[PDB]
C-alpha cells in the first residue's frame, strides 16, 4: 500500500448525505448495519434515518385480445435509508465512501450529496472592485 502526502489543505465536509434506494427492506437493513459498523470503526460520527416509502403502481390489460373489464396491476416499491455523516475530511470521505460503494449490493442504488466548506472566494474577501 502506498500513501503520499501533498502540501495542499484538504477539503472539509460539513455534512455527507448518502441515500440508498432499494427494493427489499432486508438488504437495506443489513447494509445500514454494515455502514454504521464501518463508520464506528473509522470514527466518523454518523446518523441514519428512514424516509417515506414510494410505491408506484400501474395497470395493464389482463388478456391478449378483449376484455377491458379485466386488468392486472403491478407495483414497484422503492425503500430508502439515509446515512447522514457529520464533520468529515476530504480523504476520510474518499475512503469511507470507497468502502461503502465497493460493497454496494446489486439490488440497490446510492445517491450522495456532499456539502463542502469553503471560506470565501478571493476577489470578494475585502476588496471592493
Amino acid at each position: 500500500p502506498e500513501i503520499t502526502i501533498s502540501d495542499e489543505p484538504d477539503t472539509l465536509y460539513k455534512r455527507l448525505s448518502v441515500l440508498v434506494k432499494g427494493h427489499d427492506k432486508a438488504v437495506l437493513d443489513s447494509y445500514e448495519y454494515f455502514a454504521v459498523l464501518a463508520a464506528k470503526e473509522l470514527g466518523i460520527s454518523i446518523k441514519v434515518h428512514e424516509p417515506p416509502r414510494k410505491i408506484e403502481r400501474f395497470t395493464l390489460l389482463k388478456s391478449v385480445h378483449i376484455f377491458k373489464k379485466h386488468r392486472v396491476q403491478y407495483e414497484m416499491r422503492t425503500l430508502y435509508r439515509c446515512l447522514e455523516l457529520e464533520h468529515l475530511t476530504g480523504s476520510t470521505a474518499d475512503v469511507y465512501l470507497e468502502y461503502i460503494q465497493r460493497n454496494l449490493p446489486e439490488g440497490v442504488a446510492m445517491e450522495v450529496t456532499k456539502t463542502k466548506l469553503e471560506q470565501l472566494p478571493e476577489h470578494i474577501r475585502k476588496p471592493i472592485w
Partner: protein
C-alpha cells in the same frame, strides 16, 4: 432481421431523424420567431418543407422492441403489454411485483 417490415421502416425513420436534426432545428428557429421578417420565414418555410419528410420527428412511432406491436407499449421498458407481463410474471423483470393494496 428486425422482427417486422414496419420495424425496418421505423428504424430508418430514427436514423433519418438523427441525420437531419440540426437542419431542422436551425431552420425552424427562424420559422418560429416573431422578431424576424416574415419574408425570411416564408423561404425557410419552403426549406423545411423541402427536406425529406421521412426525416421529420412526428413521423416516428415507438414500438415494442421485441414484439413490434405499435400500441400498448410502456415507455420505460419499451415493451408491449403482453411481453412485459410475460417477463414480469416469470419474475424476470426486477422489482416488479403483482400489486396488492
Amino acid at each position: 432481421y428486425y422482427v417486422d417490415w414496419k420495424m425496418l421502416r421505423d428504424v430508418k425513420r430514427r436514423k433519418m431523424a438523427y441525420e437531419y436534426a440540426d437542419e431542422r432545428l436551425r431552420i425552424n428557429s427562424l420559422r418560429k420567431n416573431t422578431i424576424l421578417p416574415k419574408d425570411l420565414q416564408e423561404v425557410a418555410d419552403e426549406e423545411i418543407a423541402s427536406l425529406p419528410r421521412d426525416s421529420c420527428p412526428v413521423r416516428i412511432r415507438n414500438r415494442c422492441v421485441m414484439t413490434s406491436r405499435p400500441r400498448g407499449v410502456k415507455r420505460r421498458w419499451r415493451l408491449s403489454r403482453i411481453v412485459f407481463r410475460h417477463l414480469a410474471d416469470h419474475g424476470q423483470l426486477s422489482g416488479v411485483q403483482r400489486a396488492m393494496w
